[PDB]
């Protein structure tokens, strides 16, 4: 059952995908194959080349219809259709996704917080896409979006934010709150992410920190 490849991560190129598609004689099959290009072209920055590949489907299963409804939603969000986009994702059952499909679901809600300037709900929902993530890379990935939604965000949003009693979001935003109180003072800043991790040695963060934390603790002017 080539379809089941739609509920896994597709971590190939769209080029790998189309290739695959010319070498495929069954219709399903070729169906399968433009529905993960079509996911792979969004990761590659090319959603109008996504959308117009979606068009190009014949018919479709059902769980092919699942992963284009999901991939409209996400190109939606690309394109700042931030309602459609919601409106497209609410009416998936995620009881009917794979973990590999929730995780696209929360990111794709993610990138609709982070488009109506809500830093904070797109890190919730990007806490809550990091749940479904085994991928290295793309959990990897994940820390550094979260880290520069955090960067991006007002400092009395920072100061005031309630982490809602979980934990994840609150060890996020007193780390953020630790580099904005101290990165005007370099010395303090590596004790005060010492204290963070010490504090925290088991978020997410704390293991694996964002690129621009490690940038500033290996660099010496
Ligand atoms: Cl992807």
């Given at each position: 059952?080539?379809?089941?490849?739609?509920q896994?991560?597709?971590?190939?190129?769209?080029?790998?995908?189309?290739?695959?598609?010319?070498?495929?004689?069954?219709?399903?099959?070729?169906?399968?194959?433009?529905?993960?290009?079509?996911?792979?072209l969004?990761?590659?920055?090319?959603?109008?080349?996504?959308?117009?590949?979606l068009?190009?489907?014949?018919?479709?299963?059902?769980?092919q219809?699942?992963?284009?409804?999901?991939?409209?939603?996400?190109?939606?969000?690309?394109?700042?259709?931030?309602?459609?986009?919601?409106?497209?994702?609410?009416?998936?059952?995620?009881?009917?996704?794979?973990?590999?499909?929730?995780?696209?679901?929360?990111?794709?809600?993610?990138?609709?917080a982070?488009?109506?300037?809500?830093?904070?709900?797109?890190?919730?929902?990007?806490?809550?896409?990091?749940?479904?993530?085994?991928d290295?890379?793309?959990?990897?990935?994940?820390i550094?979006?979260?880290?520069?939604?955090?960067?991006?965000?007002?400092?009395?949003?920072?100061?005031?934010?309630?982490?809602?009693?979980?934990?994840?979001?609150?060890?996020?935003?007193?780390?953020?709150?630790?580099?904005?109180?101290?990165?005007?003072?370099?010395?303090?800043?590596?004790?005060?992410?010492?204290?963070?991790?010490?504090?925290?040695?088991?978020?997410?963060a704390?293991?694996?920190?964002?690129?621009?934390?490690?940038?500033?603790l290996?660099?010496?002017?």
């Open positions: 059952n080539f379809t089941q490849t739609l896994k991560d597709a971590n190939a190129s769209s080029e790998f995908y189309i290739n695959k598609l010319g070498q495929t004689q069954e219709l399903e099959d070729q169906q399968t194959y433009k529905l993960l290009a079509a996911r792979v969004i990761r590659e920055n090319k959603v109008e080349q996504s959308a117009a590949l068009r190009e489907l014949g018919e479709l299963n059902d769980a219809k699942l992963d284009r409804a999901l991939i409209e939603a996400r190109i939606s969000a690309a394109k700042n259709a931030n309602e459609v986009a919601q409106n497209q994702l609410r009416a998936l059952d995620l009881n009917k996704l794979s973990p590999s499909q929730k995780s696209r679901y929360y990111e794709t809600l993610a990138i609709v982070e488009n109506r300037k809500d830093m904070i709900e797109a890190v919730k929902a990007r806490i809550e896409m990091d749940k479904n993530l085994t290295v890379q793309r959990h990897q990935d994940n550094d979006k979260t880290w520069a939604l955090l960067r991006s965000a007002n400092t009395g949003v920072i100061n005031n934010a309630s982490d809602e009693g979980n934990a994840a979001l609150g060890g996020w935003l007193t780390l953020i709150k630790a580099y904005n109180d101290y990165i005007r003072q370099p010395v303090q800043l590596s004790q005060a992410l010492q204290s963070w991790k010490n504090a925290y040695p088991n978020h997410a704390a293991t694996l920190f964002p690129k621009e934390l490690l940038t500033l290996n660099f010496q002017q």
